[PDB]
Amino acid sequence: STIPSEIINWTILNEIISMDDDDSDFSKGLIIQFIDQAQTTFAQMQRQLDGEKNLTELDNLGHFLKQSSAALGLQRIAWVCERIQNLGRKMEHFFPNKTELVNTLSDKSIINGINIDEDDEEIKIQVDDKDENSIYLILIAKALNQSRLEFKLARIELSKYYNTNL
Secondary structure, three states, X not given: OOOOOOOOOHHHHHXXXXXXXXXXXXXXXXXXXXXXXXXXXXXXXXXXXXXXOOHHHXXXXXXXXXXXXXXXXXXXXXXXXXXXXXXXXXXXOXXXXXXXXXXXXXXXXXXXXXXXXXXXXXXXOOOOOOOOOHHHHHHHHHHHHHHHHHHHHHHHHHHXXXXXXX
């Protein structure tokens, strides 16, 4: 499947533009909660990659954040989390380069002010025929770097539509 080109699904973009004051405050609270959730989630995935390397936990973490991001329309985060899930389940063996995924952005402008590697963490896991999990862990590490960028881009977008720094 292909990563969506828009950061926010148009369903949710319509709601944002149409919401009254009560619904807008409520949705803003949801987003603030999601931001704290995703930062906890990413840091738990990083600690796994650096420590126990439990693929089952990495899968559960991606499953959890796919749902919370998708419910807010943040479909690119959701797509990457789905890759992490399926890599953790050993059902995928591929994760696209950052240049390919950035190139799919429908709005070429949200990149140019940003260091897209700023939130990267070095991938220290080696391919090893004695560790059947090594390849999946390396691809999850790549996907986590993509996630952190998609997360920063989603925050920049949401900040524009809610007129405050989220």
